[PDB]
A paper describes a structure:
SecA is an evolutionarily conserved and essential ATPase that is required for protein translocation in bacteria. The catalytic core of SecA (amino acids ~1–832 in E. coli) contains five domains: nucleotide binding domain-1 (NBD1; amino acids 9–220 and 378–411), the polypeptide crosslinking domain (PPXD; 221–377), nucleotide binding domain-2 (NBD2; 412–620), the α-helical scaffold domain (HSD; 621–672 and 756–832) and the α-helical wing domain (HWD; 673–755). In addition to the catalytic core, most SecA proteins contain a relatively long C-terminal tail (CTT; also known as the C-terminal linker [Hunt et al., 2002]), whose function is not well understood. In E. coli, the CTT (833-901) contains of a small metal binding domain (MBD; 878–901) and a structurally flexible linker domain (FLD; 833–877).
Author numbering: 13 to 248, 276 to 290, 295 to 334, 349 to 834
């Protein structure tokens, strides 16, 4: 890791820089042609990574001509990092935007597409539109993906060499591609390269945010009707023994758990709407309706024979994490937050890299200061502000709440320090203050600072000064720049922006984001964090004496020392809280792996179906398994004749497979028969009746109706399964309790239920193709 991979990349950077004159000599057309040359070399078997130096140099030259921007060495380093499965930490102002142009080019060369993942659509459109001329200069096409975009335009967007889009719409496009009924319906290609704009939020904070496609269901009016057909048998354990037995329908064992809940909230409702809601008494039936709660309304409609009011359910679901783990290559960017490299490597095998700034980082991060009380802390803070503003140095003070901002505001005013508070209610004022936030001695209080935030220009923004002018002359802009130079230089001499944190937050990342506001692009700066024994943060030592021992080092109302071990102790606490968080996270991700693997498995199988034209083989093969398994249920393999249930098999075949065979007559006529030949008879009859229907309809039509039925049934059982899993998982605050562990039983019932779903899949597919009505000559 380390400078170990950084010096490797610096070596390459030297090669790229060394390449510059070469690239300066080439024509526009020769630069354009480079892409084709690289692609020809890749086709002829060159390793992409070997092209990094040249390709980057080409891109940089292209940017020099097109944008008039020459990527810095560190941008090249970042681009090289982003070629790996790595997270690139790039300080604010280091031009994450421009840097990202490099690995997009490089990973487009293989001709398999690039997905640039933005935080929102505006940036996707902006970056796409702004970068379009660069990549066309180098003979590549750029796509933009938006929610609500027509499928052909989405297809166009994904078929372009480099695509820009948001995280969400990519995920929804995946779900929709995995709801397609033909491969031409797909919008995406094979998921090749994903570059994610803010991985802190997107891959960590939003890791578990579900992306969901919902719809009106379909499988209403079913389960309900069959559950309804069972209850009127019942009279005022038995009843329960009788109920479970009476499912020559859904489900050895055993409604009651863990899965067969569905059935429970389905039954207690059959039942519950029979003696519990009296017919024309508690409600009325008018105009095909019942005129409720928990499946109970739908049951009444099943009982009274009404149209059941089928209603939204989840059709498709995925977390960001589980979607992005599908890409062949994955990379991302963030602000100097990170702190979680090992987490990214654990969860994603993403190594993270701190990319050095173009100019040196010269912010002085001073040691944390600790006081007995809030009041003394505040006093020291006031004193610090007073000293630095006395030097002409501007200050940004960060607080943890509006009340604290007010508190410090009042105190500063009490001390005669002019300042402005940034109030979330007043956006115009915020922008107006931030314009002057870096003016000599300016003092600004911010509450729970957002993230990255508007650059605060040291000495003020002269650019806002001209944007202010009514009718800007030439010599006004000289007075302005000259004055600005002096202010900027004076502020730089006074030490740049000072950052004051009045508390530390429970999460240090917030502190790092506050602190990140100073020292940008090599500007001078400093930071200081202050703490007290009555800070919220000083609660996490869950012990009054313990925290109360620090009071014996004394502090002396303003005669403090600084103990560099305190800062380490504090950082250690916060990294232990973070470790605690990660332990919890890993546990939750262990639960997520079940559904993730289930989805992955089912979608792999679904796409196997989708990718093939002709499902004959699969049909025949699962036909064998289904009928074999089905006969086995009435004729146990290698058992005696007295165990056979022929009426059961004749009813089951007629009812579920529309196949009326004289098996009783077969057995009683030839004592020659034997199982295998009976199984072959049934098979042969089903086959010939089916091939007859094919001869009625045609081959092509059979292949395509087969596919459709496979997919429809797959989808329907999947959506049902998602819901069963949903109820199962949410049910786990009453199922796993007294002594025995929850989880583990969960994975068992998940696997059991998923297995059940695949065999039911086979059964229902074959049943459907066997029951489909054709007018037989």
């Amino acid at each position: 890791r380390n400078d170990r991979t950084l010096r490797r990349m610096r070596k390459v950077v030297n090669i790229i820089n060394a390449m510059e004159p070469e690239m300066e000599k080439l024509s526009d057309e020769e630069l354009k042609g480079k892409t084709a040359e690289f692609r020809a070399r890749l086709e002829k078997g060159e390793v992409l990574e070997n092209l990094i130096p040249e390709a980057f140099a080409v891109v940089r030259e292209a940017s020099k001509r097109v944008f008039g921007m020459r990527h810095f060495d560190v941008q090249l380093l970042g681009g090289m990092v982003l070629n790996e499965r790595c997270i690139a930490e790039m300080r604010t102002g280091e031009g994450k935007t421009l840097t990202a142009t490099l690995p997009a080019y490089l990973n487009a060369l293989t001709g398999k597409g690039v997905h640039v993942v933005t935080v929102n659509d505006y940036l996707a459109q902006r970056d796409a539109e702004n970068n379009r001329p660069l990549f066309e200069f180098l003979g590549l096409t750029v796509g933009i993906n938006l929610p609500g975009m027509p499928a052909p335009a989405k297809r166009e967007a994904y078929a372009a060499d480099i695509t820009y889009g948001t995280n969400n719409e990519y995920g929804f496009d995946y779900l929709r591609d995995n709801m397609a009924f033909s491969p031409e319906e797909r919008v995406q290609r094979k998921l090749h390269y994903a570059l994610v704009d803010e991985v802190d939020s997107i891959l960590i904070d939003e890791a578990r945010t579900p992306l969901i496609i919902s719809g009106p269901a379909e499988d209403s009016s079913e389960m309900y009707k069959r559950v309804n057909k069972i209850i009127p048998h019942l009279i005022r354990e038995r009843g329960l023994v009788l109920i479970e037995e009476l499912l020559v329908k859904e489900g050895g064992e055993s409604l009651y758990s863990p899965a067969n809940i569905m059935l429970m909230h389905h039954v207690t409702a059959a039942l519950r709407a029979h003696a519990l809601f009296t017919r024309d008494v508690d409600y009325i039936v008018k105009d095909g309706e019942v005129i409720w709660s928990d499946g109970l309304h739908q049951a009444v409609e099943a009982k009274e024979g009404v149209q059941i009011q089928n209603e939204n359910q989840t059709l498709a679901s995925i977390t960001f994490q589980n979607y992005f783990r599908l890409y062949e290559k994955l990379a991302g960017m963030t602000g100097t937050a990170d702190t979680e490299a090992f987490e990214f490597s654990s969860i994603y095998k993403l190594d993270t890299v701190v990319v050095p700034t173009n100019r040196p980082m010269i912010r002085k991060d001073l040691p944390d200061l600790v006081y007995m009380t809030e009041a003394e802390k505040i006093q020291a803070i006031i004193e610090d502000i007073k000293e630095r503003t006395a030097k002409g140095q501007p200050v940004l003070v960060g607080t943890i709440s509006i009340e604290k901002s007010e508190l410090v505001s009042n105190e500063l005013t009490k001390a005669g320090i002019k300042h402005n508070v940034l109030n979330a209610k007043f956006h115009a004022n915020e922008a107006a203050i931030v314009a002057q936030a870096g003016y000599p001695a300016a003092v600004t209080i911010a509450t729970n600072m957002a993230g990255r935030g508007t650059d605060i220009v040291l000495g003020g923004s002269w650019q806002a000064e001209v944007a202010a002018l009514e009718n800007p002359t030439a010599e006004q802009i000289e007075k302005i720049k000259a004055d600005w130079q002096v202010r900027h230089d004076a502020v730089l001499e006074a030490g740049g922006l000072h950052i004051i944190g009045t508390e530390r937050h429970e999460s240090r990342r917030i502190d790092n984001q506050l602190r990140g506001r100073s020292g940008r692009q090599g500007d001078a700066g400093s930071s200081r964090f202050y703490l007290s024994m009555e800070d919220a943060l000083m609660r996490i030592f869950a012990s009054d004496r313990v925290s109360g021992m620090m009071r014996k080092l004394g502090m002396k109302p303003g005669e403090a020392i600084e103990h560099p071990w305190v800062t380490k102790a504090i950082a250690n606490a916060q990294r232990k809280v973070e470790s605690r968080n990660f332990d919890i996270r890993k546990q939750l991700l262990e639960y997520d792996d079940v559904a993730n693997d289930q989805r992955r498995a089912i979608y792999s199988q679904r796409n196997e179906l989708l990718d093939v034209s002709d499902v004959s083989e699969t049909i025949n093969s699962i036909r064998e398994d289904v009928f074999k398994a089905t006969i086995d249920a009435y004729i146990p393999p290698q058992s005696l004749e007295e165990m056979w249930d022929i009426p059961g098999l004749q009813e089951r075949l007629k009812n579920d497979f529309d196949l009326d065979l004289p098996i009783a007559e077969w057995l009683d006529k030839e004592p020659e028969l034997h199982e295998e030949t009976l199984r072959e008879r049934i098979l042969a009859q089903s086959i010939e009746v089916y091939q007859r229907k094919e001869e009625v309809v045609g081959a092509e039509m059979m292949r395509h109706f087969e596919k459709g039925v496979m997919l429809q049934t797959l989808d329907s059982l999947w959506k049902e399964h998602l819901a069963a899993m949903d109820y199962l998982r949410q049910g786990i605050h009453l199922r796993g309790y007294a002594q025995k562990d929850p989880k583990q039983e969960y994975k068992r019932e998940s696997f059991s239920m998923f297995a059940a779903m695949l065999e039911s899949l086979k059964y229902e597919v074959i049943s459907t193709l066997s029951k489909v009505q054709v007018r037989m000559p």
